[PDB]
C-alpha cells in the first residue's frame, strides 16, 4: 500500500545540471519548488525516467529494490501543456487510453466499468459526453480539461503519479480545485510528486514534503512546514502576513536580508538536523498487437479528421471552385495553332496545382509531435503502427479526393480526348503526383517542432522543381552538365504523362493533312511533332515510365520519413 | 509640485464596462488591482485618455481645472509589451524620442544633456551604448529593457506617469528592482498610476493608494494598508502568512456577491470623505519627422541581417541558375519557347518575391498606434518615411542584379536600350506588386491572412499573363479581367522588347513574304499571335499602366492607414 521513491547521490550532465541531491518521497503529496533556472523540472524528469539515462549518476529505488526496466509503464506523467485531443469527448479519450494501455484479456464491459470508475472519482459526470474542445468549436472549461488529462493516466492505476506544474496556465479557483482534488486523491495510498511554480498559502498549507532547488543545488528537503521552522534558525525571520513560498523564493533571490549565496546555503543545510536523518534513511537501503494499435490509431485519427471542419471541407470547396474556374476559362479547346498552347498550359496548371496544394501536409507530424513523444515513451504503440495509421487515415482520403473531383469537373468542360482510358490515366496521374508531393512533404517535415521552416523549404524546392517541367524550358536544350537535374522533378513526370496521354493522334493545322508527310516544315501540325520537339518518347513506355518513377519516389520518400521518425530524439 | 488626478462618476459603454466609479489619485504611487475580467485595465485607459471619448460619462480633472485637449502629450504611458526597437542602442532610442518629442528650439547639446540626465537617473550606464536586442542578435537583459522603455517617456518630464502592468512578463528579482525604482522615482513629486497583476507582499508593502475593481464595480478605494484594516470589519477574518493582495482576489471569488460588496463599500467610512473631496472641486515640421522616421527605419533595415542579406543571396543564386539553364538562346523552333519561358519566369518571380512586403505595416502596428497617439508624427510623414527607407532600396536592387546576371548569360537582344527597358520593366513590376502588398496588408494585426490573400490573388493574376492562355481566345464577357494583371503588363513589355526583329526559321527568309503559313518564323508573327501591338505605344502603354497601378495602390494604403482605429 505504500510507495516510497527514494533517491540518493544524483548528479547529472547533459553543464552540471543537478549537483549533490538526496531525498525520500513518502506516499503523501510531495512538492518540488524553486526558480525556473534551478533543477526544479529536471529532477522531476530524472525521477520519472523520461530523461535519457546517460548522465544519471545515482540510484533511484522503489520500496527497496531498484527501478525496473519498464518503470514508465506502471506510472503517470501529466505533461504541463495538455496533449489531450479537443475533437473528441472525454469518454472517447479514456476509451483510447484504456484500449491502448490495459490488457487484451479484459473485454469492453470491464474496461468501460473502469472508465466509469475513473470518471466517477474525478467528478466528470456533467461533461462525460461533451467534446473537450478548444476555442475552434464548443468545448468544456480549462479547469476540467486538466483533470481529463489527469484521468488519462489513472486507468492503469499507478501508485506513483508525476505532474509537471499543474497550476501554470490556469485561473485561481480552478487551480485550488484540482489541488484539493489531488489532496483527496493522495490519501488512498498514492504517491504524488509534482513541481509547482510560485504557490499561494492555500496551496502550500496542504503539502506533506518539500524540496527546494536553486541552480541545481539542494536548499531544503523535509516536511513542508518545518521549512518555515528551519529558515528562522539560519537567521532569516519571515515577515508576518507574507507567503512562505514567496518567502523562500525571495530569500533565495537574495532580495530578503538576514536578520556565492547558493553554495553557502547548500552547506548551511548539509550540516543541519534535516540532512542527517534523511541520510540514515538512505543508508539503511508488447502489451498489444500490431493490428490493434493500427486500428485504434487510425480510428482516432479519422475521428479527428472528420471532427475538424477546416482541413476537410474548405479544401473540397476551393478545389470545386478552382475546377469550375479552370473549366470556364478553357471551355471548348479547338484545334487551331492556339490549341497546343491552351492544352500545354492547362496540363501544366494541373500538375503544378497538385504539388503546391500538397504542401499543407506539414501539419501531420509537427502539430502533434509532443503527443507522439509522450505516447511513445508511455508505452502505447510502436513507431511503425503510428506511422501506418496516421498515413492511412490522413493522407489517403484527402489526397485521393481532389484528383477525382478535379478531373470529373474539368475533363468534359475542356473537351479533352474523349475516351475512357484517357480519362482514367489522367485521374491516376493526378493521384500519383499528389501522393509523391505529400510523400516529399512528410520526408522533409518529419521530426520537426517549428512549422514554418518546412513550408519555406518545400516552397523553394518546388519553385526549383517546376522550372524542369518542360514548359518554361525546352529539356533538350539544357547543357549536359546540368540536364541530369530533371530526374528529380515530380511535375516533370506528371506533365510528361499528361502530355503523352493528351497529344497523341491530334491535328492542329486546320485544312492541312501532315500525317503522310509535312509540306513546308517548321509547321508543328501534328501532336507527335509537338511531343518529339519536347523530348517525349512516343512508345507506350514513356507514360508508364513516368508512373513507375513516381511510384519509386513515393516509396523512397515514405521510407525516409519513417526512418526520420524512428531515429528521433524520444526523451 | 503636486498633481492630483481626480475622477468622478465614470460610466462607460463600448456592455456597461465601468460602473459607478469615484476616486482621487494623490501624487504618490497609486495602484489598480483586480481580476482581468474586471475593469482594471479599462480604467487605466480611460484615465490616460487613450480610449475613445464616446462612452466616457464623467469628468476627469487635473488639479482643479479639467483635462486639456493635448493631455496625452504632457504624460507618459508605458505599454505592457515593449515597443522599443531591438536593433538600436539605448542612447539612439532616447535620441529618437527626444528629437521627435521635445521642441525644435533646443540644439543637440541640451537634448544630449537631458538624455544623459535620464540615463543617469535610471541607472543605465553599463548598457548606454549596447544594443537593446532580442534573442536574434546579442542584447541586454529584460530587466533593463523595461526601464529603457520607461526612460523613453521621461524625456518630456511628465508629472503623471501611467504604466500598464510593469511586472507581467518579468522574473521576480527584476520586478522587485523596477518596483523599487518607481518607489524612488515617486518621491520627486511625480504621480505614478499603474495597474498590476497579482503582486507579492514585498511589492504591496510600498504602495500608497489602492483601487480594487471586479466586473466594473468599485470594491475599495483608499490607502493600501487600510484595505486589510477594512476587510476585517466586513466580516472576512484575515489569516496570517497570507498575502493581502491574494487575500482580496481570493475573497472576491471565494474564501450576487459583487453588487453586495459594492454597496457595503458605498456606505462605508471610506466612500464619504472621498465624495467630499470630489464635491469641493505640430511640435515639429514635416521634413524633420520624415528625416527621423527614415533614419530610424534605415538603421533597423541595416541592423537586421535577415531580410537584407539573404534576399540578395537567394537572388544571386537564382540568377546564376537561370543563366545556367538558358545558356545560349539560339534561333531554332525551340528559341521562341525558351524566350517566352524565361521572361514568364522573371515576371512571375518578381511578383511572388514582392509578397514579403507584408511585414512592413503588421509587425509594427502597436508601435505605430502608440507613437501616433503619443504625438510624435503625422500619418503621412510616417508613411513616406517607412516607404522611402524600406521599399525603394530593397526592391530596386534585385532587378538590377538579376538583369546584370542573366542578360549576357542568356544572350538576349544585344543593345543598350533593350537592356535598360528590361531593367526598368522589372523595377516597375516589383514596385507594383509591393504597392498591392501594402494596399492589402495595411492596418492588419495578423500576418498570415494577407499573405494567403495575396497568394490566391497572384495565382489568379498569373493565368492572364499570356503564356498559359492565349488572350485573344477568351470569351468577351471574361476577357476584360486581363487589365487587372500586373504580370500581363510586365510580360507584354518584356516580350515586345525581346521578340522584335528576330528570325526563328533557320534557312528561311520570311520577312518579305511567308511561304507555307502556319510557320511562325518571325518574331512579329509571334507577337501578333499573342495579341501584342507592334507600334512603340504597346511597350510604354504597359509602363503607364504599371505607374497608374502604383499610384492607386499607394493611395489606398495611405487611406487605410489614415482611417485606422487609432485608440
Amino acid at each position, epitope marked *: 500500500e505504500g510507495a516510497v521513491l527514494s533517491f540518493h547521490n544524483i548528479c547529472y550532465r547533459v553543464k552540471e545540471i543537478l549537483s549533490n541531491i538526496n531525498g525520500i518521497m513518502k506516499p503523501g503529496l510531495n512538492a518540488i519548488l524553486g526558480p525556473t533556472g534551478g533543477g526544479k523540472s529536471s529532477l522531476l524528469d530524472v525521477l520519472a525516467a523520461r530523461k535519457d539515462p546517460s548522465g544519471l549518476s545515482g540510484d533511484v529505488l522503489i520500496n527497496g529494490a531498484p527501478r525496473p526496466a519498464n518503470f514508465k509503464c506502471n506510472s503517470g506523467y501529466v505533461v504541463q501543456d495538455d496533449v489531450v485531443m479537443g475533437t473528441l469527448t472525454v469518454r472517447e479519450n479514456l476509451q483510447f487510453s484504456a484500449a491502448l494501455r490495459l490488457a487484451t484479456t479484459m473485454t469492453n464491459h470491464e474496461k468501460n466499468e473502469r472508465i466509469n470508475r475513473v470518471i466517477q472519482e474525478l467528478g466528470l459526470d456533467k461533461v462525460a459526453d461533451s467534446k473537450v474542445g478548444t476555442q475552434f468549436i464548443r468545448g468544456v472549461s480549462g479547469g476540467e480539461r486538466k483533470r481529463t488529462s489527469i484521468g488519462m493516466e489513472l486507468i492503469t492505476d499507478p501508485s506513483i503519479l508525476f505532474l509537471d506544474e499543474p497550476t501554470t496556465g490556469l485561473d485561481s479557483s480552478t487551480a485550488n480545485a484540482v489541488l484539493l482534488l489531488l489532496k483527496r486523491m493522495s490519501k488512498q495510498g498514492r504517491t504524488i510528486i509534482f513541481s509547482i511554480h510560485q504557490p499561494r498559502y492555500s496551496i502550500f498549507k496542504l503539502f506533506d514534503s518539500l524540496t527546494l532547488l536553486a541552480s541545481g543545488r539542494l536548499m531544503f528537503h523535509g516536511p513542508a512546514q518545518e521549512a518555515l521552522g528551519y529558515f528562522e534558525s539560519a537567521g532569516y525571520h519571515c515577515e508576518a*502576513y507574507n507567503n512562505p513560498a514567496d518567502f523562500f523564493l525571495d530569500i533565495i533571490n537574495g532580495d530578503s536580508t538576514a536578520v556565492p549565496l547558493i553554495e553557502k546555503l547548500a552547506e548551511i543545510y548539509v550540516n543541519s538536523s534535516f540532512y542527517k536523518e534523511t541520510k540514515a534513511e538512505l543508508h539503511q537501503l508488447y502489451t498489444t498487437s500490431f493490428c490493434h494499435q493500427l486500428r485504434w490509431v487510425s480510428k482516432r485519427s479519422f475521428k479527428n479528421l472528420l471532427g475538424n471542419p477546416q482541413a476537410s471541407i474548405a479544401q473540397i470547396i476551393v478545389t470545386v471552385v478552382l475546377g469550375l474556374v479552370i473549366g470556364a476559362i478553357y471551355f471548348g479547346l479547338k484545334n487551331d495553332s492556339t490549341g497546343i498552347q491552351n492544352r500545354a498550359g492547362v496540363l501544366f496548371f494541373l500538375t503544378t496545382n497538385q504539388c503546391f496544394s500538397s504542401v499543407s501536409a506539414v501539419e501531420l507530424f509537427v502539430v502533434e509531435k509532443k503527443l507522439f513523444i509522450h505516447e511513445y515513451i508511455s508505452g502505447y504503440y510502436r513507431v511503425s503502427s503510428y506511422f501506418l495509421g496516421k498515413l492511412l487515415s490522413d493522407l489517403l482520403p484527402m489526397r485521393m479526393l481532389p484528383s477525382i473531383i478535379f478531373t470529373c469537373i474539368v475533363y468534359f468542360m475542356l473537351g479533352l480526348k474523349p475516351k475512357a482510358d484517357a480519362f482514367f490515366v489522367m485521374m491516376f496521374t493526378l493521384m500519383m503526383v499528389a501522393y509523391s508531393a505529400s510523400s516529399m512533404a512528410l520526408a522533409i517535415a518529419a521530426g520537426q517542432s517549428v512549422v514554418s521552416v518546412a513550408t519555406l523549404l518545400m516552397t523553394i524546392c518546388f519553385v526549383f522543381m517546376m522550372i524542369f517541367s518542360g514548359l518554361l524550358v525546352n529539356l533538350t536544350t539544357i547543357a549536359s552538365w546540368l540536364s541530369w537535374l530533371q530526374y528529380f522533378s515530380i511535375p516533370r513526370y506528371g506533365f510528361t504523362a499528361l502530355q503523352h496521354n493528351e497529344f497523341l493522334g491530334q491535328n492542329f493545322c486546320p485544312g492541312l493533312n501532315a500525317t503522310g508527310n509535312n509540306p513546308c516544315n517548321y509547321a508543328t501540325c501534328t501532336g507527335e511533332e509537338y511531343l518529339v520537339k519536347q523530348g517525349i518518347d512516343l512508345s507506350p513506355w514513356g507514360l508508364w515510365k513516368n508512373h513507375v518513377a513516381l511510384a519509386c519516389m513515393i516509396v523512397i520518400f515514405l521510407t525516409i520519413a519513417y526512418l526520420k521518425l524512428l531515429f528521433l530524439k524520444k526523451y | 509640485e503636486g498633481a492630483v488626478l481626480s475622477f468622478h462618476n465614470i460610466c462607460y459603454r463600448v456592455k456597461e464596462i465601468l460602473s459607478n466609479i469615484n476616486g482621487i489619485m494623490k501624487p504618490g504611487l497609486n495602484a489598480i488591482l483586480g481580476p482581468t475580467g474586471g475593469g482594471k485595465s479599462s480604467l487605466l485607459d480611460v484615465l490616460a485618455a487613450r480610449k475613445d471619448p464616446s462612452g466616457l460619462s464623467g469628468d476627469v480633472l487635473i488639479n482643479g481645472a479639467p483635462r486639456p485637449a493635448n493631455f496625452k502629450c504632457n504624460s507618459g504611458y508605458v505599454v505592457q509589451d515593449d515597443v522599443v526597437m531591438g536593433t538600436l542602442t539605448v542612447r539612439e532610442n532616447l535620441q529618437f524620442s527626444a528629437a521627435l518629442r521635445l521642441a525644435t528650439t533646443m540644439t543637440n547639446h541640451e537634448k544630449n544633456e537631458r538624455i544623459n540626465r535620464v540615463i543617469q537617473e535610471l541607472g543605465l550606464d553599463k548598457v548606454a551604448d549596447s544594443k537593446v536586442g532580442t534573442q536574434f542578435i546579442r542584447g541586454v537583459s529584460g530587466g533593463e529593457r523595461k526601464r529603457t522603455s520607461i526612460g523613453m517617456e521621461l524625456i518630456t518630464d511628465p508629472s503623471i506617469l501611467f504604466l500598464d502592468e510593469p511586472t507581467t512578463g518579468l522574473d521576480s528579482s527584476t520586478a522587485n528592482a523596477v518596483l523599487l525604482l518607481l518607489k524612488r522615482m515617486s518621491k520627486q513629486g511625480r504621480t505614478i498610476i499603474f495597474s498590476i497583476h497579482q503582486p507579492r507582499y514585498s511589492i504591496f508593502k510600498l504602495f500608497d493608494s489602492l483601487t480594487l475593481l471586479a466586473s466594473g464595480r468599485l470594491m475599495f478605494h483608499g490607502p493600501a*494598508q*487600510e484595505a486589510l*484594516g477594512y476587510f476585517e470589519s466586513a466580516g472576512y477574518h484575515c489569516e*496570517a502568512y497570507n498575502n493581502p493582495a491574494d487575500f482580496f482576489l481570493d475573497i472576491i471569488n471565494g474564501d450576487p456577491l459583487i453588487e453586495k460588496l459594492a454597496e457595503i463599500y458605498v456606505n462605508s467610512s471610506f466612500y464619504k470623505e472621498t465624495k467630499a473631496e470630489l464635491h469641493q472641486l505640430y511640435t515639429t515640421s514635416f521634413c524633420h519627422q520624415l528625416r527621423w522616421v527614415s533614419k530610424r527605419s534605415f538603421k533597423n533595415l541595416l541592423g537586421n541581417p535577415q531580410a537584407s542579406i539573404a534576399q540578395i543571396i537567394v537572388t544571386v543564386v537564382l540568377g546564376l541558375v537561370i543563366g545556367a539553364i538558358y545558356f545560349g538562346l539560339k534561333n531554332d523552333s525551340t528559341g521562341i519557347q525558351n524566350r517566352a519561358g524565361v521572361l514568364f519566369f522573371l515576371t512571375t518571380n518578381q511578383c511572388f518575391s514582392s509578397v514579403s512586403a507584408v511585414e512592413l505595416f503588421v509587425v509594427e502596428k502597436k508601435l505605430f498606434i502608440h507613437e501616433y497617439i503619443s504625438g510624435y508624427y503625422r500619418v503621412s510623414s510616417y508613411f513616406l518615411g517607412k516607404l522611402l527607407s524600406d521599399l525603394l532600396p530593397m526592391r530596386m536592387l534585385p532587378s538590377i542584379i538579376f538583369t546584370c546576371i542573366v542578360y549576357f548569360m542568356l544572350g538576349l537582344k544585344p543593345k543598350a536600350d533593350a537592356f535598360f527597358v528590361m531593367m526598368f520593366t522589372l523595377m516597375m513590376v516589383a514596385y507594383s506588386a509591393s504597392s498591392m502588398a501594402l494596399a492589402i496588408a495595411a492596418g492588419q494585426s495578423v500576418v498570415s491572412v494577407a499573405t494567403l490573400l495575396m497568394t490566391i490573388c497572384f495565382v489568379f493574376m498569373m493565368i492572364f499573363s499570356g503564356l498559359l492562355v492565349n488572350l485573344t481566345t477568351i470569351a468577351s464577357w471574361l476577357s476584360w479581367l486581363q487589365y487587372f494583371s500586373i504580370p500581363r503588363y510586365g510580360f507584354t513589355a518584356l516580350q515586345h522588347n525581346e521578340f522584335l526583329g528576330q528570325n526563328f526559321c533557320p534557312g528561311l527568309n520570311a520577312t518579305g513574304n511567308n511561304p507555307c503559313n502556319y510557320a511562325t518564323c518571325t518574331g512579329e508573327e509571334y507577337l501578333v499571335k499573342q495579341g501584342i501591338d507592334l507600334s512603340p505605344w504597346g511597350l510604354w502603354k504597359n509602363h503607364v499602366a504599371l505607374a497608374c497601378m502604383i499610384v492607386i495602390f499607394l493611395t489606398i494604403a495611405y487611406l487605410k492607414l489614415l482611417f485606422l482605429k487609432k485608440y
Partner: nanobody
Amino acid sequence: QVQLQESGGGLVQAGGSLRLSCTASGRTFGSYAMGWFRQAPGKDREFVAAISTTGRSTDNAGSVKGRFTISRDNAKNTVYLQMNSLKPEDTAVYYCAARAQLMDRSRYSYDYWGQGTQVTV
C-alpha cells in the same frame, strides 16, 4: 529589517510630562501597525497602546481611560507615546513592538522588537 530603538526615560515623580520616540530603522515604515508594551520586575508583559498604519484607529488598555495618547507620522519614521498623571503603577520598562499590518492587542505575534527603556516614576 525594520529595527526599533526607543528614546526617553527620566524622572518627574507624577508630574505628567513624558514623551517617548521609538524610531524604526528601515525602508518601508508606513505598512507596520505597531504598539507599546510594559513590564515591571516581577510581572508579565502588558499591552498599553497601539496605533495603526497611517493612523486612523487606536487601541487602549484597561487601566487607561484617556490617560495615554499614541501618535505617528510616516514621513518622519517615529511613533510617540504621550503620558500624563503618572500614578505609581508605572515603574516599569517600556517596549515598542511592530506587527505586520494590524493591531492584535496580544503578544507572541509582534515581529521586530526593540530594546526598551526604563521610566522611573
